[PDB]
């Protein structure tokens, strides 16, 4: 019996491949070669947010593009005033091993998670005076890899149990559970319309999920190793993934295909962090080579190198207005670039 | 009004920074370890991740044992790269081969090349039985043990047949082949044999951590 299902899967795979090949009207390079390159982009460290004890695994920006939350393995979640290099808050964490941290889009709330398999939401703007934990979310059977707020009283979390989840912070329950991956889901990015979110995993696959109904509408493949970082394009019709095969590649939802390969012969280390710009023209990607590469998303070329970190770059972000780039790295230093 | 909030930010920063200095002192005082395989080791030492604290000679040790996580260790093992050492408890009685290649992967990992490994060789007590009458992996799955003799630099460990000792040092040498190849001052793979009589593994890990910290002190103090 199982042979029949295997043959059915094989013929569906062949049909999908044929449809995708038909969809390949032209490559991105052919219609892109006519645009001017962005040039040798070089931005210096405008501000170094020193103060973390251990490696910075994650960081997130606030909506106002002025405050900044950061997560490090020493167990501290420091909120920074990047304008005046001032530490607004220093939140201790129950679990030191934190791999993700999120800032609520309306402020007032910050979430973090890691190997504890728990997403913890902290209330910043409280009438008591001090930041304390509000709701402790449990239910994921694997390590938390990425958590993102979509709005208040609701959060989307990715885990190492090959599943993504939606939560209601008031009740603390799982509204919708997303399944379908066979590898460790690593990064999730929300669409600007707050209705879909992609998830790259270790099975060399990227899946687009529908938040409300909760099904995997479209799946994407093309990498030969684990996808470590993912980031929606400033418009929610494309996203870019970085993998351990020392390459970065761009996907499109409405094409179900491959767009551009950001790889170079010297580059032999994987990608840890991917973050687009406000215009999407720059695909700033973190690398294990202790530096960040500013890949022009349209023209696949190394148009910038963000050298300055002694150890591996673990996280990367861009302000909402695009006025700054935060680069956390394993050298326990957060650097702002502009 | 701007000046008032400026002083408010300055005083908040002052409080946060003094707290961060105290936390720096606490964090530097503490040493971090990761257990990879046993619950018996955790029990004798003193949720997604289990945290264990213990004290030896007034030095604070933190031990992290991974619990509710999948068998794929290929990325969450990257977190434990700043730890003092990775305690690798091998069953050693196929368990032996899988553990051998786990140790290979840890030793040759890019982020664990600077991370030292402590290797403990569990299940030594029943190793004597399994070599005396088991006729098992050491006899069959590792036929090179027959042509392998006991090295001269062998601890006595009296009260056992020479076959027991030669098999023990045989699989220890199999681990040390991976340990020595691509090996430098970055990490050493200290080999030890488990002792279930007492919990002296705490002292073994303490001495190994002392050696590791002495090595990095030789490094950073420009004494090499």
């Amino acid at each position: 019996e199982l042979d029949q299902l295997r043959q059915e899967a094989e013929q569906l795979k062949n049909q999908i491949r044929d449809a995708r090949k038909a969809c390949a009207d032209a490559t991105l390079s052919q219609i892109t070669n006519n645009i001017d390159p962005v040039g040798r982009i070089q931005m210096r460290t405008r501000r170094t947010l020193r103060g973390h004890l251990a490696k910075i695994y994650a960081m997130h920006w606030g909506t106002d593009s002025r405050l900044l939350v950061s997560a490090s393995q020493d167990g501290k979640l420091i909120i920074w005033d990047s304008y005046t290099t001032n530490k607004v808050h220093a939140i201790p964490l129950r679990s030191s091993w934190v791999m993700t941290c999120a800032y609520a889009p309306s402020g007032n709330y910050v979430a973090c998670g890691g190997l504890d398999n728990i997403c913890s939401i902290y209330n910043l703007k409280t009438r008591e005076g001090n930041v304390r934990v509000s709701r402790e979310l449990a239910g994921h059977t694997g390590y938390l890899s990425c958590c993102r707020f979509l709005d208040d009283n609701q959060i989307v979390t990715s885990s190492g149990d090959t599943t993504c989840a939606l939560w209601d912070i008031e009740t603390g329950q799982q509204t919708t559970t997303f399944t379908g991956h066979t590898g460790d889901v690593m990064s999730l990015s929300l669409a600007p319309d707050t209705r879909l979110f992609v998830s790259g995993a270790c099975d060399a696959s990227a899946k687009l999920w529908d938040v409300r109904e909760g099904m995997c509408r479209q799946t994407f493949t093309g990498h030969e190793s684990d996808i470590n970082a993912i980031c929606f394009f400033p418009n929610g019709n494309a996203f870019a993934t970085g993998s351990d095969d020392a390459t970065c590649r761009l996907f499109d939802l409405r094409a179900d295909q491959e767009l551009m390969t950001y790889s170079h012969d010297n580059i032999i280390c994987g990608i840890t962090s991917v973050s687009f710009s406000k215009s999407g023209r720059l695909l700033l990607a973190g690398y294990d080579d202790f530096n960040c590469n500013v890949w022009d998303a349209l023209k696949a070329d190394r148009a910038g190198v963000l050298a300055g970190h002694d150890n591996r770059v673990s996280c990367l972000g861009v302000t909402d207005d695009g006025m700054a780039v935060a680069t956390g790295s394993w050298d326990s230093f957060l650097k702002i670039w502009n | 009004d701007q000046r008032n909030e400026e002083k408010a930010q300055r005083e908040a920063n002052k409080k946060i920074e003094k707290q961060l200095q105290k936390d720096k002192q606490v964090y530097r005082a503490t040493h971090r370890l990761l257990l990879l395989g046993k619950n018996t080791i955790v029990k004798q030492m003193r949720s997604g991740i289990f945290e264990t604290k213990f004290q030896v000679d007034k030095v604070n040790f933190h031990m992290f044992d991974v619990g509710a996580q999948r068998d794929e260790r290929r990325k969450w093992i990257q977190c434990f790269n700043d730890v003092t050492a990775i305690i690798f408890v091998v069953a050693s009685s196929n368990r032996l081969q899988a553990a051998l290649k786990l140790f290979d992967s840890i030793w040759n990992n890019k982020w664990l090349r600077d991370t030292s490994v402590i290797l403990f060789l569990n299940k030594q007590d029943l190793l004597a039985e399994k070599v005396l009458a088991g006729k098992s992996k050491i006899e069959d799955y590792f036929p090179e043990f027959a042509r392998y003799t006991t090295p001269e630099d062998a601890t006595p460990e009296p009260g056992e047949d020479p076959r027991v000792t030669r098999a023990k040092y045989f699989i220890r040498d199999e681990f040390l082949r991976i340990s020595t190849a691509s090996g430098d001052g970055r990490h050493y793979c200290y080999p030890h044999f488990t002792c279930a009589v007492d919990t002296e593994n705490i002292r073994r890990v303490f001495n190994d951590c002392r050696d590791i910290i002495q090595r990095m002190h030789l490094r950073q103090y420009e004494l090499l």
Partner: nanobody
Framework: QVQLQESGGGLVQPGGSLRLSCAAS????????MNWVRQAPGKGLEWVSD????????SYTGSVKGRFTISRDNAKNTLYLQMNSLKPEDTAVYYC?????????????????????RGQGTQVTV
């Protein structure tokens, strides 16, 4: 789209030879330290042998040492694993799993039950 399509061996007499290759169309087949793992029925996945990225650095287990030999073929993108003199420790689904990452000598998790780049199809029923 990593694929590790297998070429089934079939029936082999005790002490015979099979020497069945595999297929690969997703990865480059030159930067991955691929090995061989098999799942005998009623046992967990067990390692067999390894081959380096380009050549040499062969590793075996005793159950296969001196009996079967590997042959990485870059041109055909095939891992041969020439095998002969079969014993009862056989009749498993053979997976020619590859390294999780390229340009490294690290195989952290290949013998797991949920590894992705494994493949299936080589039955070696004795």
């Amino acid at each position: 789209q990593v694929q590790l399509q297998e070429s089934g061996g079939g029936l082999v007499q005790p002490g015979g030879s099979l020497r069945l290759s595999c297929a690969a169309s997703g990865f480059t087949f030159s930067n991955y330290k691929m090995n061989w793992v098999r799942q005998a029925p009623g046992k967990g996945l067990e390692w067999v042998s390894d081959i380096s990225q380009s050549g040499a650095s062969i590793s075996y287990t005793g159950s296969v040492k001196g009996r079967f030999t590997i042959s990485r073929d870059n041109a055909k993108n095939t891992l041969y694993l020439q095998m002969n003199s079969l014993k009862p420790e056989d009749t498993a689904v053979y997976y020619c799993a590859r390294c999780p990452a390229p340009f490294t000598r690290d195989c952290f998790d290949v013998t797991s039950t949920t590894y992705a780049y494994r493949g299936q199809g080589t039955q070696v029923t004795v």
